Amino acid sequence: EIPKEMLRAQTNVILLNVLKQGDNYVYGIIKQVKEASNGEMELNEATLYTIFKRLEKDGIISSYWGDEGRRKYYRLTEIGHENMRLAFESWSRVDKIIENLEA
Ligand X SMILES: CCOc1ccc(-c2nc3ccc(-c4nc5ccc(N6CCN(C)CC6)cc5[nH]4)cc3[nH]2)cc1
Residue 15 near residue 33, CB atoms below 8 Å: yes
Phi, psi for 72 (deg, rounded to 5): -100, 125
Q: Based on CB atoms, which residue is closest to ligand X, 45 or 58?
A: 58
CA angle 6, 7, 9 (to 5 degrees): 60
> Under the criterion CB under 6 A, does residue 13 sit at the interface with ligand X?
yes
Does the annotation list 13 as a binding residue? yes
Applying the rule CB under 6 A, the residues between 15 and 74 that interact with ligand X are: 16, 60
- SS3 state at 75: strand
Give the dihedral of Cα atoms 87, 56, 18, 26; nearest 10 deg.
160
Residue 17 interaction partner, one of ligand X, its own copies, none, beta carbon < 5-8 Å per kind: its own copies
Residue 15 near residue 48, CB atoms below 8 Å: yes
- Residue of the chain from 12, 32, 62, 77 that contacts ligand X (CB under 6 A): 12
Binding-site residue ranges for Cu(2+) = 13, 95
Residues that bind its own copies (CB under 8 A): 1-2, 6-7, 10, 13-14, 17-18, 21, 32-33, 35-37, 40-41, 79, 82-83, 86-87, 90-91, 93-94, 97-98, 100-102
